[PDB]
Each structure stands twice: as C-alpha cells, then as structure tokens.
C-alpha cells in the first residue's frame, strides 16, 4: 500500500552496511560470508518479502545471493574505473585477478562502466537489487511475488518521471536497466561455475533459515 | 528510421521456418537416438537463424566480427526461446519439431537433462500465463540477439555499442506500441514490458545451464558462424 515515494524511502533505509576485509581468495570468501547476514536483514525489509513463507524466502535467497553480492560490488566500484572495491580496504585491479578469474573480473568491470555511463542513481540501484531478490528464484506465493515486482516497476517509472524524463525516455531507461539484470544473471552463472571449479560453495538452506531468525510461535 | 509498425513487420517477415525431424514410419522413436536427432535439428535451425539475424534491423550495420560475437553469445538462448514459443500451446510438452514432441519422462535418459527440461516447461507456462503474443515474441528474440553479447566485446567498438543501444531502444518503443495498441493502460504497459524483459534473465540462466549440459556430453565455431555470416555477393 506504500506510495512510490514510501517504497524508495523504505529501500534506501534498508541498505546494508559496507563491510571491511579482515590469501586473496580467503579474504574474498570471508567477506562474502559476512555480507550474507546483512543481505538477509536487507531482504526482510524489502516490502512484501516477509509475506512469503519462510521456505519461499529461503529459496529466493538461495537463487539471488550471488547476483546481489555482484550488483553491490559493481555499485560500490562505479566511481573506481578499472578497479573493483570489494571493501574500502580491498580495492583490486584486473592484474590482481590474473584461472578463470579475470574473465569474471572483466564482466564486473564492464557492468560498473555501464552503470557509470547510464548515471545510475542510488534510488534506481535499490529497486534493481530488490527485483533480483524477487525474480531470480520465481521460475498464491507467485501471485504475490508478481505484485511486488509490479510495484517496483511502478516505483522505477516514478523515479524517472520525477527526474524529468519523457514517457519515451522512461520506458527506454526501464528496459536498459532490466537488460543489465540479464547480464548480472549471466555473471552469477559464470561466477558459480568459477567457484565450483575451485572448491562449501553455496549457503545451505539451514544457514539461510537461521539467519532469517524465524519467529518463535510456529 | 523505421516506425514501430515497420519494425514489427520486418521482424515477422524475418521469422525462420519451423523445421522437422526425420520421418520414417518403420523406425519407432528411441531414447538412444534422441540426442542425435536434437543435434541434427539444432544444426539445421542454426543456418536459418543466421538468415534471420541478418534481417533484424540494424544488425548488418555492425562489423562482421561483432555480428559473430553477438551470435556466439545468443545462439542457444535463441534456440531455447524458439522452442518455448513452439511449445506454448502444448502444456507439459516441448515441441522440438512437430514430429518431435517430448515430455519430461523422455528427458530422464540423460543425466542433467530433466532439470533443463523443467526450466523450459516453466518458461512455456509463463508465456501462456502472460498470453505472450507473436509480435512480442519476435521483439524479445531480437533483443536477445542484440543484448546477450554486448557486455563481452576502441572508437569503433564504442560506435557499435551506441548503435546497438539505439536499436534496442527502438525495440523497446515497438513493444510499448504493441501494448498500447492492445488497449493496455500506461501502467500496464510498463508493468508488462518489465515482466517480458525479466523473462530474458531466466532465458539467459537456462542457456548457461544448457551450455554446461552440452559440454557434459559442442558449439558453433567462430569460423563457422563467420562463414555463414561472412557471405559473398
Ligand atoms: C558458503 C557460501 C559463500 N561462500 C562461498 C563463497 O562464495 C563467494 C562469493 C563471492 C566471492 C567474491 C566476492 C566477495 C564479496 C563481494 O561483495 C562480491 C564478490 C564478487 C565475487 C564474484 C563473486 N567474488 C570473487 O571472489 C570473484 C571471482 C572472480 C572475479 C571477481 C570476483 C568469493 C566467494 C563465499
Ligand atoms: C556444431 C554444434 C551443434 N551443436 C549441436 C547444437 O547444440 C545443441 C543445441 C540444442 C540442442 C537441443 C535443442 C535442439 C533444437 C531446439 O530448437 C532447441 C533445443 C533445446 C536444447 C536445450 C538446448 N536441446 C536439448 O537437447 C536439451 C537438453 C536438455 C533439456 C532440453 C533440451 C541439442 C544440441 C549445436
């Protein structure tokens, strides 16, 4: 029932903290592992997410977590051309990423470049992250997921109309942003292949369920 | 310069034919021959896919090298979305060809096959739930061709990317025009545009899972794609 403005405010307020790094792959794995609980706290504040069953919340997180870590990384790195800001004390260039790592590193750098070129705004970024969370695992509960996604679409169009875009420019920018989500899914698929080529790769159902911190009256 | 109506007409006229598998009423269907039949069909469809791509407005303005890169990135997503479209009116079945209509129990002979079979069936069910129209389908296939390779490609590269983005914006305008013509309100137009484009993320996912499956058992070479795209006059 939130207005578009209330939805943006809710998502901006829900943003996770930026964590610091504590051998490169052990540092990156540990950082991702610590980002996960913050991602779950964020997910619980995306309007509509907690109306799903806990089972469905876990299945959406299992499908979206890697895309969500990647989009956050690309967002943090936008203002750092040619580098990836994993953490404020962990800025890497592609030379440090040099088997199979540099290909994904370049895919992420290219996303960051695209966001910088489109002048992606924070209010649009938090809508896109929310769409990843609700859409990556979708293919009563589905009806609700689709209603949330429709509300996020409305909210994106609202932000672009507020910025003064014509209707044509609004639908063109909406499409440009949603096409970037297909590239984020592609990078997550390649990134999973890369992680399975090296290695406990995905968070277990029970780990995610524990972090969701279920209510005590079942 | 094309109007949205001219874009739709060009894309509908470019559609490839629906190809068949071998007929022989003395050879009952066998699970052991299934992969060979599917490989033979995909290879024949690829030739028509190159003819189709050359007819997608703006595609042949790119360099050959970039045309090949786009097709290398998109060919399996394009085969998969065509299969989903051909299957849309056949719940529970994948219509590889009119004489090769399979259910998921036939997908169980090969390790890893049924998971991809189920993702394709789910996409077909989504197309039915959205009542996807043929004019929208041809737009989505063209977006896949232009978009899937654009993030993995100099001043010439910058000019190509700009052109690709301009053609993709034209296809967006064309999808919105079709939705407006169908009577949808402005809110429903944006919502449906977003629903359709989010399905492209699922198609990408299925292509990546599909590629891993084909290598478990490969793909068109740059020279072959270059050879079919690199035509003489
Ligand atoms: C048990 C479940 C979790 N564990 C399994 C482990 O999964 C991981 C997930 C992420 C990463 C890091 C990382 C960290 C933090 C971040 O915010 C973003 C990323 C981006 C990213 C691509 C994914 N990555 C790479 O290392 C990388 C590889 C190639 C090129 C560029 C990056 C490492 C391991 C953690
Ligand atoms: C020189 C290289 C030639 N290579 C052979 C070609 O690779 C192939 C491409 C496609 C397919 C077929 C196929 C055929 C026609 C079609 O229109 C769609 C599909 C869908 C598809 C998923 C991809 N598939 C499966 O078999 C399948 C697997 C799991 C679940 C369901 C389907 C087989 C081989 C290129």
Swiss-Prot record, chain A:
A lipid is attached at residue 127 (S-palmitoyl cysteine). Changing residue 82 to V: Destabilizes the receptor and decreases its affinity for estradiol at 25 degrees Celsius, but not at 4 degrees Celsius. Changing residue 207 to A: Abolishes interaction with NCOA1, NCOA2 and NCOA3. Residues 1-218 are annotated as: Self-association. Changing residue 46 to E: Has higher transcriptional activity in the absence of wild type ER. Inhibits transcriptional activity when coexpressed with the wild type receptor. The modification Phosphotyrosine is found at residue 205. The gene is ESR1. Belongs to the nuclear hormone receptor family. NR3 subfamily. Residues 3-218 are annotated as: Transactivation AF-2. Nuclear hormone receptor. The steroid hormones and their receptors are involved in the regulation of eukaryotic gene expression and affect cellular proliferation and differentiation in target tissues. Ligand-dependent nuclear transactivation involves either direct homodimer binding to a palindromic estrogen response element (ERE) sequence or association with other DNA-binding transcription factors, such as AP-1/c-Jun, c-Fos, ATF-2, Sp1 and Sp3, to mediate ERE-independent signaling. Composed of three domains: a modulating N-terminal domain, a DNA-binding domain and a C-terminal ligand-binding domain. The modulating domain, also known as A/B or AF-1 domain has a ligand-independent transactivation function. The C-terminus contains a ligand-dependent transactivation domain, also known as E/F or AF-2 domain which overlaps with the ligand binding domain. AF-1 and AF-2 activate transcription independently and synergistically and act in a promoter- and cell-specific manner. AF-1 seems to provide the major transactivation function in differentiated cells. This is Estrogen receptor. Selective estrogen receptor modulators (SERMs), such as tamoxifen, raloxifene, toremifene, lasofoxifene, clomifene, femarelle and ormeloxifene, have tissue selective agonistic and antagonistic effects on the estrogen receptor (ER). They interfere with the ER association with coactivators or corepressors, mainly involving the AF-2 domain. Binds DNA as a homodimer. Can form a heterodimer with ESR2. Interacts with FOXC2, MAP1S, SLC30A9, UBE1C and NCOA3 coactivator. Interacts with PELP1, the interaction is enhanced by 17-beta-estradiol, the interaction increases ESR1 transcriptional activity. Interacts with EP300; the interaction is estrogen-dependent and enhanced by CITED1. Interacts with CITED1; the interaction is estrogen-dependent. Interacts with NCOA5 and NCOA6 coactivators. Interacts with NCOA7; the interaction is a ligand-inducible. Interacts with PHB2, and UBE1C. Interacts with AKAP13. Interacts with CUEDC2. It comes from Homo sapiens. Residues 1-218 are annotated as: Interaction with AKAP13. 17beta-estradiol binds at residues 35, 76, 194. Residues 3-215 form the NR LBD domain. Phosphorylated by cyclin A/CDK2 and CK1. Phosphorylation probably enhances transcriptional activity. Self-association induces phosphorylation. Phosphorylated by LMTK3 in vitro. Glycosylated; contains N-acetylglucosamine, probably O-linked. Widely expressed. Not expressed in the pituitary gland. It comes from the Eukaryota. It is linked to Estrogen resistance: A disorder characterized by partial or complete resistance to estrogens, in the presence of elevated estrogen serum levels. Clinical features include absence of the pubertal growth spurt, delayed bone maturation, unfused epiphyses, reduced bone mineral density, osteoporosis, continued growth into adulthood and very tall adult stature. Glucose intolerance, hyperinsulinemia and lipid abnormalities may also be present.
């Amino acid at each position: 029932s939130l207005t578009a403005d209330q939805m943006v405010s809710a998502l901006l307020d829900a943003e996770p903290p930026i964590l610091y790094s504590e051998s490169m792959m052990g540092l990156l794995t540990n950082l991702a592992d610590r980002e996960l609980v913050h991602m779950i706290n964020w997910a619980k504040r995306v309007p509509g997410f907690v109306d799903l069953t806990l089972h469905d919340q876990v299945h959406l997180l299992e499908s979206a977590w890697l895309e969500i870590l990647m989009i956050g990384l690309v967002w943090r790195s936008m203002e750092h051309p040619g580098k990836l800001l994993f953490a404020p004390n962990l800025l890497l260039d592609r030379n440090q990423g040099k088997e199979g790592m540099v290909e994904i590193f370049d895919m992420l750098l290219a996303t960051s470049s695209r966001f910088r070129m489109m002048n992606l705004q924070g209010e649009e970024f938090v809508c896109l992250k929310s769409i990843i969370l609700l859409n990556s695992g979708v293919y009563e509960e589905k009806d609700h997921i689709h209603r949330v996604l429709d509300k996020i679409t409305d909210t994106l169009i609202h932000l672009m109309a507020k910025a003064g875009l014509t209707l044509q420019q609004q639908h063109q920018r909406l499409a440009q942003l949603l096409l970037i989500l297909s590239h984020i899914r592609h990078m997550s698929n390649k990134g999973m292949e890369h992680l399975y080529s090296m290695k406990n790769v995905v968070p277990s159902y029970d780990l995610l369920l524990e972090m969701l911190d279920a209510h005590r009256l079942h």
